[PDB]
């Protein structure tokens, strides 16, 4: 029943992101945390790369817009400056 999960905003597959997969499967009886699971580490690395790409793309697009604005400003100011006589 993945459509209902999607409507509620969860992952369509309960094996996706969620408590059942992202929480540690076990811990030492003393209480010491278990070493991170391999799948969780891989998934964290993938999410970090995804976030880094999001940041990079957003920054590149913003820088491009700012550079275009500066180019328009330079063009207009220079064409105005040509009026000197």
């Amino acid at each position: 029943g993945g459509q209902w999960r999607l409507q509620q905003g969860l992952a369509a597959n309960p094996s996706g992101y969620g408590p059942l997969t992202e929480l540690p499967d076990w811990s030492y009886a003393d209480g010491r945390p278990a070493p991170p699971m391999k799948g969780q580490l891989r998934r964290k690395a993938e999410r970090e790369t995804f976030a880094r790409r999001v940041v990079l793309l957003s920054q590149e697009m913003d820088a491009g817009l700012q550079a275009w604005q500066l180019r328009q400003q330079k063009l207009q100011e220079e064409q105005r400056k040509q009026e000197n006589a």
Partner: protein
Amino acid sequence: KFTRSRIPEKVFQASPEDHEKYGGDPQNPHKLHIVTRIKSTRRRPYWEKDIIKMLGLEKAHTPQVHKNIPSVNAKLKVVKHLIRIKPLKLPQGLPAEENMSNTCLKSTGELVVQW
């Protein structure tokens, strides 16, 4: 013959009804696409295969973030029948360096900096 298909521009001109239906504001449009491949490139032309490879959508159901800029949009228009596109929503803005490792892409299309 079978050829590339030229999509008329009127197809990609949203109407107010579409704006209400999908919840996107034409002013201040979203910056990034989340594109997932939901369809095989098999039995599709080699040019669609190549576009998918370029966009990095070889794996199905693996979201990929792309710029919402005209060239990327041209490629996405070529392969629009194989992909699902949703805007990337940033309720807390783009992640900071501190929490770059604590993000998660919710199925709604939101990148939350807490997980």
